[PDB]
Symmetry: C2
Subunit: 51 residues, 2 copies
């Protein structure tokens, strides 16, 4: 999947500390558990074919 | 492991945006790859005992 993704470092701007201007990313999202549940726990097509 | 850690949202400061004050965390770090390599590939005590 692809989801929210916030990346932000060092505004390099005005002279008081802890500045950090934000930028927006499109980030690779991969569930690793919901995916497995969808594959075998939710839908049983894969499982039955393999059996 | 435990390593650096950065949590930072919305300074709630100036009426102009891109504020984003940083806070520091002590965060649970877990390698999962270096860990396995250390367990079985670096040191072979575990492996030999199991064999």
């Amino acid at each position: 999947k692809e989801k929210d993704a916030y990346f932000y470092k060092e505004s390099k701007g005005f002279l008081k500390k802890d500045l950090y201007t934000r930028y927006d990313y499109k980030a690779p999202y991969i569930s690793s558990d919901d995916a497995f549940l969808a594959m075998f726990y939710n839908s049983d097509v894969m499982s039955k074919e393999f059996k």
